Amino acid sequence: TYEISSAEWEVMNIIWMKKYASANNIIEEIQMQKDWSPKTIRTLITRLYKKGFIDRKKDNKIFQYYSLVEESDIKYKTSKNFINKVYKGGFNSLVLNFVEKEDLSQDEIEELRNILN
Amino acid sequence: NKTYEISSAEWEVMNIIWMKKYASANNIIEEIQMQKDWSPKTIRTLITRLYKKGFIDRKKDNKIFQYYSLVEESDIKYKTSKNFINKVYKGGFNSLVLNFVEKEDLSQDEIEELRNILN
Amino acid sequence: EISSAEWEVMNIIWMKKYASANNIIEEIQMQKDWSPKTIRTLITRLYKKGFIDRKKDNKIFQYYSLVEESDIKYKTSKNFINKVYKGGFNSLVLNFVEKEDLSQDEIEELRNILN
Amino acid sequence: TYEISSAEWEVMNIIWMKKYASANNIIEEIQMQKDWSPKTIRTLITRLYKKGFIDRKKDNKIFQYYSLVEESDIKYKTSKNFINKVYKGGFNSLVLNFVEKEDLSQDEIEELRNILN
DNA sequence: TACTACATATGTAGTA
DNA sequence: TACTACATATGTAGTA
DNA sequence: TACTACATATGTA
DNA sequence: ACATATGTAGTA
């Protein structure tokens, strides 16, 4: 089983957010929210290339990478893996822990209802 | 500067500690040796690391140490989850709950509780 | 058979034992979004299939279940698993753990549900 | 959104069971646990083909249909849907519903524990 | 208990 | 782009 | 409440 | 192609 590293996650989102994406195309978008070498980043791409979460496509004269797995399909999958290891009481016990630490503003708490519908 | 995290493997440990407030060497093992399958040594190590990371502490209560948490549960869990979501979900907490219902991971029995948890 | 959309109604009725035309609708027009007529239709169907019956309690019909709830859900899930999971019930629970859909808070209850 | 109908399922399981499968190779294995026409079946496959759940492969001189979706990954998902449409209280409320209707023998109740581990 | 050992996964980047 | 290199961190567990 | 219309998904062929 | 069951919903 191949898993996606937290450092890596950075990358996927950048790709997921742009469907298609290039070596540098990504770096530029990362070298702003993070601070790594353009070489360190590239390795994070190849790494995901090999784990096989994305693929290439010599679109221009350069590779263009794209996801292979479904974003939300995987994120749900990963949170579920996490929470399970952390919170003994599934998804709920967690939500109950956000409000306990009042991480919710009435403007936001409102949206949820209209999200549970 | 040096910052220390609590490993996902380690997390199992805290959960027992936290669950018993006071906790001995084996006391934990016995309690993990059902929800998991490690060696009573592997585990003890997890404790120790957690001790040197400084999330727990000891205290020879009887003739054997009793480790106890140093950090506050809810305090840390909420903190950890935030870190997670931010790395994973681009749209914060919301975007996540949205993701669970799109995957129908909730029963109206549960979805109900939430509201009465929102008020 | 009882259709998935129809299920919505039976839940309401079983929830209320006794149940009226609109009384159903109201309790449905929040957890769903259909036309009061669509709904009504679902009831008629069920009445016609013979899962529920009427009874002019006040001056309007009062439908109630004819089939025993837990007796049906059990029957229904049986047919289901059978069409989907090759290995009966087991092979299902097994599918739920492998996709970690269970929190230890939850897995716990099971044991004491198994004794 | 495209779904997999109860009838269809009989086809997939034949397929996932043999990973690789032939038009007739299927019918054979179904005309024992079921009673349909070698044309009724074929159509179920077709539908599934178009819905996009399986795909063909001219292996010999005949097509060989193979699964396109991951078994466990979808059965999990469908059950989910079902459970929540029916049982108010998710998975739990269901298992508790099998015991009440004593649909379990101590021989099998055992396995569970060792399966919950 | 305390202290020791190790192979893989991960963060982070220089050279062909 | 491709391929190489390394130190800390994490999973697992033997020896004093 | 009671009959009918309608596009879709669906059981059978 | 064809009949039925189904999500939705208006004219009886």
Side-chain angles (χ1 to χ4, degrees):
Chain A
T1 298
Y2 274 135
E3 306 191 337
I4 178 170
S5 167
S6 49
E8 279 155 38
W9 275 99
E10 264 336 314
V11 158
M12 303 300 280
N13 302 302
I14 309 301
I15 288 179
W16 274 327
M17 175 224 301
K18 314 168 84 296
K19 301 289 180 61
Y20 242 32
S22 89
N24 274 285
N25 236 176
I26 279 190
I27 289 180
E28 289 177 54
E29 274 293 289
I30 277 190
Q31 278 197 304
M32 198 162 264
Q33 172 181 56
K34 284 282 187 172
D35 155 27
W36 289 324
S37 176
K39 279 297 190 181
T40 291
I41 307 179
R42 257 190 189 96
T43 291
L44 278 206
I45 307 187
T46 312
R47 291 271 255 275
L48 290 177
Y49 176 69
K50 323 175 172 196
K51 296 195 166 189
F53 284 60
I54 51 171
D55 213 322
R56 44 189 47 186
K57 193 313 211 65
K58 182 88 82 169
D59 184 293
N60 179 284
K61 209 46 184 66
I62 57 165
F63 285 21
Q64 299 246 314
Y65 306 89
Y66 47 89
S67 180
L68 286 193
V69 283
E70 224 298 71
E71 194 183 28
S72 66
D73 252 82
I74 213 168
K75 289 175 172 187
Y76 159 73
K77 174 184 190 174
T78 299
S79 304
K80 200 79 183 301
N81 170 54
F82 165 72
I83 288 174
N84 279 41
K85 115 207 160 206
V86 173
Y87 295 88
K88 276 293 73 165
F91 186 78
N92 277 51
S93 171
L94 175 180
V95 204
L96 175 60
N97 191 248
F98 264 46
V99 196
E100 191 76 300
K101 300 296 181 180
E102 295 178 301
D103 178 11
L104 284 175
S105 61
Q106 191 72 59
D107 260 354
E108 304 169 298
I109 287 186
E110 184 63 48
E111 192 175 307
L112 313 188
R113 275 197 182 66
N114 289 297
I115 278 294
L116 310 179
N117 311 313
Chain B
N1 303 314
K2 307 187 175 183
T3 297
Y4 278 119
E5 305 182 304
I6 154 180
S7 166
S8 46
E10 295 184 335
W11 265 108
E12 306 313 323
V13 172
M14 304 263 80
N15 273 327
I16 298 304
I17 309 176
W18 261 308
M19 194 204 302
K20 295 161 54 71
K21 297 278 185 47
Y22 235 19
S24 62
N26 311 285
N27 246 190
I28 300 170
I29 302 185
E30 285 148 39
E31 284 279 296
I32 265 191
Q33 275 197 296
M34 299 182 145
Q35 178 203 49
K36 280 300 158 189
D37 146 63
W38 277 299
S39 168
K41 290 296 179 197
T42 310
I43 293 181
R44 189 114 41 175
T45 294
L46 294 188
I47 298 186
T48 294
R49 295 267 195 60
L50 289 224
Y51 180 69
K52 304 182 171 184
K53 291 194 171 195
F55 279 115
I56 50 165
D57 187 3
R58 44 186 53 174
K59 179 273 199 168
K60 181 84 71 180
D61 169 284
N62 201 290
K63 246 317 296 180
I64 53 190
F65 288 6
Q66 309 260 312
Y67 307 57
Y68 52 134
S69 187
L70 297 191
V71 305
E72 223 303 72
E73 194 170 356
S74 59
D75 252 290
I76 185 187
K77 286 202 169 182
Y78 165 51
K79 180 185 155 292
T80 296
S81 300
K82 293 291 289 303
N83 201 63
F84 173 74
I85 297 170
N86 288 55
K87 94 181 181 179
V88 183
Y89 292 84
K90 280 299 69 181
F93 180 42
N94 261 38
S95 184
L96 187 170
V97 174
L98 184 52
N99 192 265
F100 265 55
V101 210
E102 178 107 283
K103 297 287 189 177
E104 272 172 309
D105 184 5
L106 297 181
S107 63
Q108 188 63 51
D109 265 2
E110 295 183 305
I111 293 184
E112 167 80 39
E113 187 187 316
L114 303 203
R115 298 207 182 69
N116 293 304
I117 282 306
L118 288 183
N119 319 306
Chain C
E1 294 202 306
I2 167 169
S3 160
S4 42
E6 294 160 347
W7 270 96
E8 276 314 322
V9 156
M10 297 293 261
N11 272 307
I12 311 326
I13 302 166
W14 279 314
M15 182 199 293
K16 311 198 62 175
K17 297 283 202 52
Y18 222 17
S20 82
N22 298 289
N23 237 169
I24 274 187
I25 299 177
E26 285 167 48
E27 282 281 305
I28 270 195
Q29 291 194 301
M30 298 179 108
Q31 198 263 315
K32 273 303 170 184
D33 163 56
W34 284 304
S35 177
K37 290 294 183 171
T38 307
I39 292 189
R40 217 174 294 275
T41 297
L42 283 181
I43 305 186
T44 320
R45 298 272 187 67
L46 287 178
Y47 159 102
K48 299 188 165 184
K49 299 192 187 182
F51 284 87
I52 53 178
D53 217 344
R54 44 188 59 176
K55 186 278 193 185
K56 180 74 77 174
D57 187 294
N58 181 274
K59 201 71 176 66
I60 55 175
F61 285 31
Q62 297 273 296
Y63 300 89
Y64 54 105
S65 163
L66 295 188
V67 294
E68 216 317 76
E69 183 165 352
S70 62
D71 220 326
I72 193 177
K73 290 192 177 286
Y74 163 54
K75 186 188 176 293
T76 290
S77 310
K78 285 298 277 288
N79 190 45
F80 170 81
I81 289 140
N82 276 57
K83 87 182 185 187
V84 183
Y85 288 88
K86 270 292 68 177
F89 185 54
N90 274 18
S91 176
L92 196 180
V93 173
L94 198 79
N95 201 235
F96 269 39
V97 200
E98 208 92 90
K99 299 296 187 181
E100 290 174 274
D101 186 356
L102 304 178
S103 54
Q104 194 72 48
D105 262 4
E106 279 167 47
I107 276 183
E108 175 89 349
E109 201 191 314
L110 287 221
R111 284 196 176 69
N112 287 288
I113 282 304
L114 293 198
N115 308 308
Chain D
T1 304
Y2 276 136
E3 299 192 314
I4 182 166
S5 78
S6 45
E8 293 164 359
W9 284 98
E10 277 292 34
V11 151
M12 302 284 199
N13 273 311
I14 309 334
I15 294 189
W16 290 318
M17 188 178 270
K18 321 162 61 297
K19 295 297 202 58
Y20 240 28
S22 93
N24 304 282
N25 210 173
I26 286 187
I27 300 174
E28 276 186 50
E29 273 289 315
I30 280 190
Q31 286 188 317
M32 296 202 111
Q33 174 184 41
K34 279 294 180 182
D35 150 53
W36 292 313
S37 173
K39 290 289 185 170
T40 297
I41 296 178
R42 203 168 280 280
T43 289
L44 284 186
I45 299 185
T46 309
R47 312 278 203 69
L48 283 196
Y49 177 61
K50 297 172 194 169
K51 293 187 174 194
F53 280 87
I54 59 184
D55 203 356
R56 53 192 44 178
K57 194 287 176 171
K58 191 72 157 191
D59 183 299
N60 186 289
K61 199 53 198 71
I62 52 183
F63 276 6
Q64 289 294 308
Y65 296 134
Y66 62 122
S67 188
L68 278 192
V69 286
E70 215 294 75
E71 195 188 67
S72 72
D73 246 297
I74 215 169
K75 293 186 156 187
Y76 167 44
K77 180 179 176 305
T78 297
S79 310
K80 277 292 296 312
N81 189 62
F82 162 57
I83 283 105
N84 295 56
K85 87 181 181 171
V86 185
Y87 298 55
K88 284 279 72 176
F91 191 60
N92 258 36
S93 192
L94 183 167
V95 191
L96 184 50
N97 193 267
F98 262 33
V99 180
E100 198 68 310
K101 295 292 182 182
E102 302 168 301
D103 189 5
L104 289 168
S105 74
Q106 190 57 53
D107 273 351
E108 308 175 307
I109 286 188
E110 194 76 82
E111 189 174 307
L112 312 188
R113 282 203 183 65
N114 284 300
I115 283 287
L116 312 185
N117 311 308

